[PDB]
Amino acid sequence: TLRAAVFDLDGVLALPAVFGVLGRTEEALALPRGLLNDAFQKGGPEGATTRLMKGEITLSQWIPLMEENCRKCSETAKVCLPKNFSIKEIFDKAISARKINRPMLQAALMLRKKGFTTAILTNTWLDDRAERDGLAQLMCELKMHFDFLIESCQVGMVKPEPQIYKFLLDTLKASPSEVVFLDDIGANLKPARDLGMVTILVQDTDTALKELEKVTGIQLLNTPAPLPTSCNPSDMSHGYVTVKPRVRLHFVELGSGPAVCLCHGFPESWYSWRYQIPALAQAGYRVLAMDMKGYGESSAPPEIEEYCMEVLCKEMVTFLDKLGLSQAVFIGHDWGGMLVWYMALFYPERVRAVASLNTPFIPANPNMSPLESIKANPVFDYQLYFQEPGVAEAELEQNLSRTFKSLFRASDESVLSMHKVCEAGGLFVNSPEEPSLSRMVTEEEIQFYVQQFKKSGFRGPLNWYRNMERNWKWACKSLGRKILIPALMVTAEKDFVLVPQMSQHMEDWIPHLKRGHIEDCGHWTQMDKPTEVNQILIKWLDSDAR
Amino acid sequence: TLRAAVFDLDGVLALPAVFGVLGRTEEALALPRGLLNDAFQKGGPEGATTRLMKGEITLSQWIPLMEENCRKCSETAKVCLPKNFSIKEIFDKAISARKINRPMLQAALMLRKKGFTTAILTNTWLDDRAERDGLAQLMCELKMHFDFLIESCQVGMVKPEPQIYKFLLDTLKASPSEVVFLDDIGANLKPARDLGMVTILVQDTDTALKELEKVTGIQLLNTPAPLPTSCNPSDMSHGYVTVKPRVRLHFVELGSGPAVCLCHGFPESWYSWRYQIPALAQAGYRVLAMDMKGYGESSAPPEIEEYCMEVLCKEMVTFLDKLGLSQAVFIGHDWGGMLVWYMALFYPERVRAVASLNTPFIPANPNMSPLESIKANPVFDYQLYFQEPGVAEAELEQNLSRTFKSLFRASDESVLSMHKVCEAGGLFVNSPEEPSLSRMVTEEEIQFYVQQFKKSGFRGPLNWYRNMERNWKWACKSLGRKILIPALMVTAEKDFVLVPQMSQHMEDWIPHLKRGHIEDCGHWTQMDKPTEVNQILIKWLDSDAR
C-alpha cells in the first residue's frame, strides 16, 4: 500500500524539460541530430556532466567543458558549429522558459493532503550564473509543497546510480513497495522498479496522472479548483516592533519586494490573510500581515482612547519608522479597511497605495453626531450593543469556539442578523450552543482564533467601536481633502452590513478610484473567496503599486 | 539655562531652501522679481498656501490654486507666463534637489548627546504627489535623530501664529528661556523671541552654528568626525524564524531593498553590526542582522554537531525559505565570515553576493588533518584550548563583564595574546580582574553583551570551534569548485590572528574577487573602524550586489 510519492523535476514538476531544449536547438541551427545531447552526456559517468550533477564543479565551471565537448562532437561529425554558438545563451534561455507544471504540482499537493509523504528527487547543478535567481525562485516555490527535496549536487550521488534510490528510501523511512516514483527518463525509473517501487514514465502529464490516480486510488484528474496556499503559523517569520512604552505590534512577514501592509477587521487576526500571504509574496511583494492593536501577540491596553483612529494611525506610522520603511501599500478589511482610508487621508506620503475590502470610504458628516448617523441605519444596531463596556466582552468571551463558529460563516450558512441586536440582548441569543462548522473554516483554524483570543479577549478589539465622537472630530479635519494616491475598493455582493451600495459616492472623494467586485461573497471576504481576492489584489498591485 | 533646541526644516535642516527655488525660477524664466513668491503667499492667512500648511487640502489639490494665483499676479504685472509654465515640474525638481544640511544635523545630534531635548518645527504639507516617496525618505532619515517632529499640516496650526509656539513649549515641557529656536525666516523667529526664547536667524550654517555654540556653551563647529548612527535594541524590529523543531533564529530587521544578511563572529551578537545597520538601511538595503545559532535570542542546543558548518548553512537556507527570500547578500565577520564563504560554495543560487571581514577563504587541505593544520600556526593555539568541553565555558562565564571588557579592545589597548593560551591555562590568566573600558565601547554596550550571554552562555558559541574534522570532510567535497559569484574580502591591518597575508592566495579560488583594506584596525572591525567598514560595504553593495 502506497504512502509516498516521489517526483522528478525536469520534465515532471517543471516544463518544458530543459533537456528537450537541446533537440530544439539542433533543429533551429540545422545541426546534426543528437549532436548537442551527445556532447552533453560525453564520457557518461566520467564526463563533465556527471561531475556537475554530483556537485564537484559549478555550472559556470561546466560551461567551457560543454563547449569543448561540442567542438569534439562536431569535428567527428564533419560539421561546423556557427559563428555565434554560445552554450551560456542557450542554457540561460532554456531555464528562463522552464515553468512549474501546475497540474503535476496540484496532484502532489492532493497526495500530501491525503497523508502521503512527498519528495522531489532531481539531478541538478550548483548554479553560480549571474541569472541564477530565476531558478532559485522556482525551487523555492516548488520545495515548500514537499516533505523532502533531494538534489544530486548536494548528496554527491546521481540518478541512475543505485545509491541515490537507497538514500531516497532512507529519507522517506519507507519500504520500496510503499513508493510511487515519477520520472521522464526511462533509465532513471529502472533502479526504482528493480527495487520494487511503483514507477510511472512521464511523457504527457495527463496520462501520467491517470496512472498515478489508478495506482493511489485518489482522484487527481478533473478535481475541483483547489484553494490558494495557506499559512502554518509555526513556519512563519514573526516580527515584533515596540511603537511606544506600553505598545508592541506583532506581524507575520513573507516575501521580497515593495512592502504590503495587511490590516484585519473585527474580531480577527493576521491569520485572516492566510490565503493572501503566500500568493502576494509569490507575486513579488514583501507582505507584512499585522495583528492589529488589541489582538493576538500585539499589545492590548485597556483604555478606550488607545483605540481611536488618530492613535492607531500614528502607531502605524511609527511601525514604518522603526522598520525603516518610507512607504507601504495599505490593504484593509472591515475595521482595518477604515484605518487604511484614514492612513491615505492623513499620511499620503507613507502610503504607496490604498486598498479596502468591503469597507467603503464615507466622510464624517459635520452636521450630525456619529451616534445620530449610526442610529439612522438598522444594520449598524450591533455597534450600539458594543458601546457599554463589559456587555459584549462577557458574551463574546463566554465560549470562544462558539463565538468564532457563529461569526465565521458564508452568506448561505445562517449568518448572524445584525438588526435588533440590542432588543434581543446579544449577538448569539438566537444562535445554537454548538454551531456547525462553516465550509470556509476547519476545526484547527477555529482553534487558532480561540488560542489567540485567550490572551487579551475582546476589550481591546471592542474599543475600536468605542471612539465614534473622537474619530468624528478627527475625520472632520480632513473634509477639504481628496484621496489622490492609487486606490482600490473591493465590494462583496452578500455582505449585508458593508453593502456594495454604501460605496456608491466614493468617486467624489477619490476620483481616480479603481474597483473590484466579488459575487456570492459575504463579510469574511479573504476566506470566503480567496482565489478571487488574490486575483483582484495581484492585478491592482502589479498595475498601480508596482 | 538652555536644555532644548528647535530647528526649522527648510533652509535649516534641509538645503537648498525649497522656498529659494521660486527666486531661482523667476531669474531663469526672466519673470518679474517676486512674481512667484507673491503668487505663493497670495491672500496670506486666507490663501491656498495657509490651507495647504494647515492640512485642509493636500499638495495635489494646491497645485491648480498656485497656478491660478500665478496667472492673477502675471496679469496685474502686465506680463506673460511662458507656454510650458508648470508648477508641478518646478515643485518636483525643488524637492528632489533638497538634501539634509549635514553639519546642522551633526550639531542637533551633539546637543541631544549632551542631554538636550531636540525638535523639528516645520510649516509643511500633506504630500500626495506620485513622487512623494523622496520627501518621505528625507523626513524618515531626519526625524529619527530628534525627540519631536511638529508639522503644521498635522497640528492644523502654522508659523508665525502664536498658538504653534505655545504648542511647541507644551510638547517640550520647557519654559521659553530654556529653548533655542533656529529658523531662516525672520517673521517666524519673532513670536519665539517675543515669548523669551533664544532665537537664531539662519542664513549661512557656519554663522548660525557659531551663534548656537556660543549660546549653549557646547562645541558644535570644528568637532572631530562623529561615529555612524548606532542601534537602540528596544527601538528595532525583532524577527523570529523556527528553522527546525528545537531551533529558532533571531534577527534585527531594518530598511527596504535587496536583503543583506549580517553574520557575526565569536563571541558576539547581532549588536556587533550596530554601526552598520542604520547605514546599510539608509543606503537602500533590507538589513537582516542575525543572532547566530548559540547566541542571544536564537536557540542554543547543547550538542557539538548542531554547530558544524553543514548544519549551520542548511539552517541559513531554511531561514531564507521561511522568510520567502530566494537570495540574500551574505556579509560575515570572524566565524560568520567562514560560514559566508561556505554559503557561496554550497548554495551559490541563494547568495546574491558574499563579503567577509578579516576571515579569508582557505580551502581544506585533503592531505592533512585539521588538527595538524591548526597546530602548524602559533596564533591558532587558543582553538586547542577551546576543544575540551567545559574548560573555556567556565573561564568565559566566570565574570561576563570581565570577559567582554578583556576581549573587546582596539589593537593598541593591550589586546589579548592568542599564543601559548593552553600553556598559560586560559585566555585571561595574565589579564586584570577589572579591565579598563576600551575606547570602542561604552559601559552600557558591554552590559548588553553581558545580558545576552546570561541566557545560554558559551557552550553553543564554543561548539562552532568543536567541528574541525566534520567541517574538513564537508569542505573537501567543494575542492574542485570556484567562487564565481560577486565577492568581497576586507582585511584589517592589525588583526594579529586573522592577518591580511592569510588572504594572499584567495584569487586562485575566487578569480573576480574585490578587496578592501582597513589600516590601524584590530579584530573587532565593525566597532573599531565603523565609518570605513560602512564606506567599503556600501560602495561594494552599490557596484556588485545592486
Ligand SMILES: c1ccc(CCc2n[nH]c3ccccc23)cc1
Ligand atoms: C466596520 C464596520 C463599521 C465601521 C465604522 C462605523 C460607522 N458606520 N457608519 C458610521 C457613521 C459615523 C461614525 C462611525 C460609523 C468600521 C468598520
Ligand SMILES: c1ccc(CCc2n[nH]c3ccccc23)cc1
Ligand atoms: C461582529 C459581529 C458579526 C459579524 C458577521 C456579520 C457581519 N456581516 N457584515 C458585517 C460588517 C461589520 C460587522 C459585522 C458584520 C462580524 C463581526
Ligand SMILES: c1ccc(CCc2n[nH]c3ccccc23)cc1
Ligand atoms: C575565526 C577563526 C578561525 C576559523 C577557522 C579555524 C581554522 N583556522 N585554520 C584552520 C585549518 C583547518 C581547519 C580549521 C581552521 C574561523 C573563524
Ligand SMILES: c1ccc(CCc2n[nH]c3ccccc23)cc1
Ligand atoms: C576569542 C578570544 C580572543 C579574541 C581577541 C583576539 C583576536 N584577535 N583576532 C582573532 C581571531 C580569532 C579569534 C580571536 C582573535 C576574540 C575571540
